[PDB]
Symmetry: C3
Subunit: 51 residues, 3 copies
């Protein structure tokens, strides 16, 4: 009985799923990081003049 074919479909689907998750989380992460990059750039410029 083709548990093998069921199990092997699972493996393929899971591993693409994992991929997807990681990339989607990291793009959210990159977005959040850029938020904060743009604040830090605007503060760093402040300090350089307030100097």
């Amino acid at each position: 009985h083709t548990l093998k074919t069921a199990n092997s479909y699972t493996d393929v689907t899971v591993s693409n799923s994992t991929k997807k998750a990681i990339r989607e989380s990291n793009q959210y992460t990159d977005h959040k990081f850029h938020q904060l990059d743009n604040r830090l750039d605007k503060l760093d410029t402040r300090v350089d003049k307030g100097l």
Copy 2:
């Protein structure tokens, strides 16, 4: 089984989809949490700079 690879395969698709969404929800929760600690630190540095500034005479 033969063709109830279809029922197994279709259970695989349903479960994988719910899994992908959960992993993403949890990850992004953890991101927001860490972003927030950084936000809080920038807020208080921003306030410092606004005072360490206004002071002149």
Copy 3:
């Protein structure tokens, strides 16, 4: 034995969930850190430019 295929699915999906979370969370930490090291560098500046 949909049951045996289905229960291999459950075991594999649940392992891939946590894997995707582990990797996301490490990318997040990595970014955090970059940002922390920028903050500490700016903090120190302000504490001296507080001359």
